[PDB]
């Protein structure tokens, strides 16, 4: 019934680098989604206690959200850009597992995901 702790966001044992694509993921991809009118359900871990969603963490075992992704980027948690992309994909997939078609949040997720995929199609040159 209780909320789990949030996902890890900083691990000093993981190696650290800044790359063209990671910069783009934070400063273009995440920034653009974050400022979108539909971002708010996705800006923090799902607080299933406060939202009265007792089954959320019974169903969703790999939670992910843009607040966590932002902190992971800021703490150099990801080495490869595709690790970050995978976390965005996990976030969207979770939404489509937990929520039903026609639910407002699904329309929101679909719009944000289409925007995400469009921005990923302009991923910049790798080192």
């Amino acid at each position: 019934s209780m909320n789990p702790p949030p996902p890890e966001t900083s691990n000093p044992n993981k190696p650290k680098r800044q790359t063209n694509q990671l910069q783009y993921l934070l400063r273009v991809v995440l920034k653009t989604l974050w400022k979108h009118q539909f971002a708010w359900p996705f800006q923090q871990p799902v607080d299933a206690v406060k939202l009265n969603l007792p089954d959320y963490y019974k169903i969703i075992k790999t939670p992910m959200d843009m607040g966590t992704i932002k902190k992971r980027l800021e703490n150099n948690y990801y080495w490869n850009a595709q690790e970050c992309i995978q976390d965005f994909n996990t976030m969207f997939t979770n939404c489509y597992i937990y929520n039903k078609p026609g639910d407002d949040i699904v329309l929101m997720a679909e719009a944000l995901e289409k925007l995400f995929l469009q921005k990923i199609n302009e991923l910049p040159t790798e080192e």
Partner: peptide
Amino acid sequence: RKGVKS
């Protein structure tokens, strides 16, 4: 499961 948001 999360209700109206619009």
